[PDB]
């Protein structure tokens, strides 16, 4: 009679939910849906944006130093041969 009394009052429900879960704290169903990866989310292609912002910021740092190089203003003909002779031996 005591076992049937504890079940209908949700005591066996309460003693189950307490011991298996409060001494738990590992995550349950953290994956969830299998269609969470249906939409090709940002973490899949975030590297292309890292190339893109790295591409723009590389262009700004080269455009500025061309600007001072215009504000400052091929080196030679015998020594541009020397750039060929060194690189050929290399």
């Amino acid at each position: 009679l005591a076992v049937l009394k504890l079940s209908e009052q949700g005591v066996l429900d309460k003693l189950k939910n307490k011991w298996w879960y409060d001494k738990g704290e590992c995550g349950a169903k953290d994956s969830g849906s299998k269609e969470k990866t249906s939409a090709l989310s940002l973490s899949n292609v975030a590297g292309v944006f890292y190339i893109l912002v790295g591409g723009l910021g590389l262009a700004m740092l080269v455009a500025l130093i061309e600007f001072c190089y215009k504000s400052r203003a091929l080196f030679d003909r015998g020594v541009q041969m020397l750039l060929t002779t060194v690189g050929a031996f290399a």
Binding site: S41, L42, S43, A46, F49, Y50, V53, L56, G57, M60, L64
Partner: protein, 45 residues
Amino acid sequence: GGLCIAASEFYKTRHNIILSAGIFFVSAGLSNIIGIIVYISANAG
């Protein structure tokens, strides 16, 4: 970039303070979207 605008109202005919200012507002924007991207990417983690 906000300091260079007050450096443009005085100190006329420098003609690089405007050029220094305008790239600073844009480079703040590129620092913003790279802050947006790492926020949305690591929010999945």
